[PDB]
C-alpha cells in the first residue's frame, strides 16, 4: 500500500536533471507516477505469465529479460 506515494519529488528532480530538464512544474509528479505504474503493470504481468508457464514460483532475471524483449523495449546487460 501507498508505495506509489513512495516516489519522491527529489527523485523525479534527479531524473529530470539527467533527463536534462531544467524547469519543473508542480502538476507533473502524480502523472509521472501513473505512467510509471502502467508501464510496470504490463511488464510484471508478462514476466509473471512467463513464470506461470515456468512452473516455478520464483521469477528470474532471464524471465524479465525475455518479457521485455517481447515488448520491444529490449534491454541488454544481464543475459538472455
Amino acid at each position: 500500500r501507498d508505495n506509489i506515494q513512495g516516489i519522491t519529488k527529489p527523485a523525479i528532480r534527479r531524473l529530470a536533471r539527467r533527463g536534462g530538464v531544467k524547469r519543473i512544474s508542480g502538476l507533473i509528479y502524480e502523472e509521472t507516477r501513473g505512467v510509471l505504474k502502467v508501464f510496470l503493470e504490463n511488464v510484471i504481468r508478462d514476466a509473471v505469465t512467463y513464470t506461470e508457464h515456468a512452473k516455478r514460483k520464483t521469477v528470474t532475471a532471464m524471465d524479465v529479460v525475455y518479457a521485455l524483449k517481447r515488448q520491444g523495449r529490449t534491454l541488454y546487460g544481464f543475459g538472455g
Binding site: 508478462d46 505469465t49 512467463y50 506461470e52 508457464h53 515456468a54 532471464m62 525475455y66 517481447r70
Partner: protein
C-alpha cells in the same frame, strides 16, 4: 497448375454463422486471410521462444494457452482461452 492456399471458405462459414444476412468483398476476404497469417505467425514465434526458454521441443496446448495470454490483451484473451479450453474438453472427451 500449382494449387494455391486460402482460408476463405472456413471464415466464410463462420461469417455465415454469426451473420446469415451479410455479404463480403473478395479483397477483405484476403485481408482476413492475411490476418490469420499474422496472428498465427506471432503465436508460433512465441511458441518457439517458449521452447527455447523451456529447453523442450514438444508442443502441447498449454504452451498455446500461455502464448495467447502473452500476446493478446486480457479480457479478449480470457474469453478466447475459455473457448479453446471448452473445445479441448469437447474434442478430447470423445475421440
Amino acid at each position: 497448375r500449382s494449387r494455391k492456399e486460402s482460408y476463405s471458405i472456413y471464415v466464410y462459414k463462420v461469417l455465415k454463422q454469426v451473420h446469415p444476412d451479410t455479404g463480403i468483398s473478395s479483397k477483405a476476404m484476403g485481408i482476413m486471410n492475411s490476418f490469420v497469417n499474422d496472428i498465427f505467425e506471432r503465436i508460433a514465434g512465441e511458441a518457439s521462444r517458449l521452447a527455447h526458454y523451456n529447453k523442450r521441443s514438444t508442443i502441447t496446448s498449454r504452451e498455446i494457452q500461455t502464448a495467447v495470454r502473452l500476446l493478446l490483451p486480457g479480457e479478449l484473451a480470457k474469453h478466447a482461452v475459455s473457448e479453446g479450453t471448452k473445445a479441448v474438453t469437447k474434442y478430447t472427451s470423445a475421440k
